[PDB]
Amino acid sequence: AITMECITKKIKTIFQNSIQKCFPSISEDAIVTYANLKFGHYQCNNAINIYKKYGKELNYENAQKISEFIISNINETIFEEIKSSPQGFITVKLSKDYIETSLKKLFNGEKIDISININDIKESNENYGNVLVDFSSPNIAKEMHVGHLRSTIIGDSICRVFEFLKINTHRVNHVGDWGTQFGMIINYIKTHYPNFKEEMPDLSNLTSLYQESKKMYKENAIKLQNNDEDCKFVWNKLCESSKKEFDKLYNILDIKLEYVGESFYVPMLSTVLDLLKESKLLTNIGDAICYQSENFKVPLFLQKSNGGYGYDSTDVAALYYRLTQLNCNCVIYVTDIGQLTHFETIFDLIKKTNWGDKNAKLMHVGFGFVLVKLINLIKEGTERAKRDLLQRIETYFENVDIDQLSESLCVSAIKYFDLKQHRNSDYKFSYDNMLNVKGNTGIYIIYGYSRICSIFRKSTINVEDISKDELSLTSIYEINLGLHILKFPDIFYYILKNMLVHKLAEYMYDLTTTFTAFYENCKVLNNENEKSRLLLCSITKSLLKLCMELLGMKPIEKL
Numbered sequence: 001a002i003t004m005e006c007i008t009k010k011i012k013t014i015f016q017n018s019i020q021k022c023f024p025s026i027s028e029d030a031i032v033t034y035a036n037l038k039f040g041h042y043q044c045n046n047a048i049n050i051y052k053k054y055g056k057e058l059n060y061e062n063a064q065k066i067s068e069f070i071i072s073n074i075n076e077t078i079f080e081e082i083k084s085s086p087q088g089f090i091t092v093k094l095s096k097d098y099i100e101t102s103l104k105k106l107f108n109g110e111k112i113d114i115s116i117n118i119n120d121i122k123e124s125n126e127n128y129g130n131v132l133v134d135f136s137s138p139n140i141a142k143e144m145h146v147g148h149l150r151s152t153i154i155g156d157s158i159c160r161v162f163e164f165l166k167i168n169t170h171r172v173n174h175v176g177d178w179g180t181q182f183g184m185i186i187n188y189i190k191t192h193y194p195n196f197k198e199e200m201p202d203l204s205n206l207t208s209l210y211q212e213s214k215k216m217y218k219e220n221a222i223k224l225q226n227n228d229e230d231c232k233f234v235w236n237k238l239c240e241s242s243k244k245e246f247d248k249l250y251n252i253l254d255i256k257l258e259y260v261g262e263s264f265y266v267p268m269l270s271t272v273l274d275l276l277k278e279s280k281l282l283t284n285i286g287d288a289i290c291y292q293s294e295n296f297k298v299p300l301f302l303q304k305s306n307g308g309y310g311y312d313s314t315d316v317a318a319l320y321y322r323l324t325q326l327n328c329n330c331v332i333y334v335t336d337i338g339q340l341t342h343f344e345t346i347f348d349l350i351k352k353t354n355w356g357d358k359n360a361k362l363m364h365v366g367f368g369f370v371l372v373k374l375i376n377l378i379k380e381g382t383e384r385a386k387r388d389l390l391q392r393i394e395t396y397f398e399n400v401d402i403d404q405l406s407e408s409l410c411v412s413a414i415k416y417f418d419l420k421q422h423r424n425s426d427y428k429f430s431y432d433n434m435l436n437v438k439g440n441t442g443i444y445i446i447y448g449y450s451r452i453c454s455i456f457r458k459s460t461i462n463v464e465d466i467s468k469d470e471l472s473l474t475s476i477y478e479i480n481l482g483l484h485i486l487k488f489p490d491i492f493y494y495i496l497k498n499m500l501v502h503k504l505a506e507y508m509y510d511l512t513t514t515f516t517a518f519y520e521n522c523k524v525l526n527n528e529n530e531k532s533r534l535l536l537c538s539i540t541k542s543l544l545k546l547c548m549e550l551l552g553m554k555p556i557e558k559l
Helices: 007-022 046-054 063-072 096-105 146-164 182-191 206-216 219-224 229-252 262-279 313-324 337-350 374-393 402-419 431-435 442-458 476-486 488-498 502-522 530-550
Strands: 032-034 042-044 079-083 090-094 130-134 168-173 283-285 288-291 300-303 330-336 361-367
Touching: 007 032, 007 042, 007 046, 007 063, 007 090, 007 488, 046 063, 063 090, 096 476, 130 146, 146 168, 146 330, 146 361, 146 374, 146 402, 146 530, 182 206, 182 219, 182 229, 206 229, 219 229, 229 374, 262 288, 262 300, 262 313, 300 313, 300 337, 313 330, 313 337, 330 337, 337 361, 374 402, 374 431, 402 431, 402 442, 402 502, 431 442, 442 502, 442 530, 476 488, 476 502, 476 530, 488 502, 502 530
Parallel strands: 130 168, 130 330, 330 361
Antiparallel strands: 032 042, 042 090, 079 090, 283 288, 288 300
């Protein structure tokens, strides 16, 4: 129940206090990064900026002297080493004892419990009481595409991150269930199936009938907007069918989220517009009522020339709802990078209202293009993974469902290969690249995990007979593994700030290689520190499992 310290913030504070002591009347926020591992663990560069700003003034000959003054005002036993540099940055190494003691905190009684209090990775002014993540966003009667998939994967990872941090997290799918098409389609369904109400036609081929309707050809749309019994009946049937189709995909991915479509906001739109009209933030462009930001050229269109609802009214209403009715403290929109401006323009409007928490953190999480049915794409992947797997086995598994295992491997692989990319970057969808057991792949990560479990299956010692105090980091590799493990909170600290989850994938990858370096170099020692090594293996396993799960992967123990 004792939670990991955030080391970057700890060290940042130590340097901040030394800087303040050195230069009492200075405004200089300490910044802490990682050092080159060959030379240190962490690093602070503020002496360089202090020298550039005030250097000639305070009669210092160079930046290094400033860094030496800063060092002279630091007194910490947790630093094994602290050193300046000719450029003037400062590097530190954590002591063996700090790392060992910190690692020993990871044991709740006798089992490993990795936990992180969000209070320790944020500023105390920052509130994460209620977080909402808006992601996936398919459209009824349209095929889900690879962009939807990416949004689904990213969004689910972010949610899992907040759920790990024990945050009240709203998983919200803003489905397009109130669009243009519903007229056309609804026409066809009764221009071709009169007995619609008593017996509905086949909805198994909705995406086809969709164009069909587009080809053949509007009273039905306005009649739907006026809550006619039959049109609503048909609409509801369409939405239900498409949602079943979407749900097959979602639970193949093991991702749950709540349908809250455009339709959901329709009965409050006039209220929202009324509010905006009373706020006097809107203007007239043509016969339309819009919001013109000072900071963005393209206005939000909120009311049309007809008097009908503008195509930007739904997004504004949804944020109104999330802020005032769900009391959201953070709202995250996971979408194509090209919608960025749009959402920034929305945030700019919402910040000018009195709606909900004025300090609400509004975030756009953009993603690039991936360069056709999702479920068959994944089943193709499954076939490939199974092929590679059986081919590997060729050189007990008769008691394993190879199909489920293959699908798990594929799904995990897809998720990792996507999340390891910078979200804002485009990338090449390739089964060859993503299923390569040798590459930087989800498959690789998985086999690393199963190897680490294999160690515990094959050892003659019960890991649960070992007390935490066996732990002794005697090699540079055990030190390095310990360090990397204790860096885990830094990942969350930065994710909360920029939502770049590839940093987590990276972290995870590094965990595996660091671990490997441990193994390869300690595998030839005698039994004297064996128990401590096993303990390190146990912690590493726990952490790898957790990392995998946070990214939506499923650890497999035996392979």
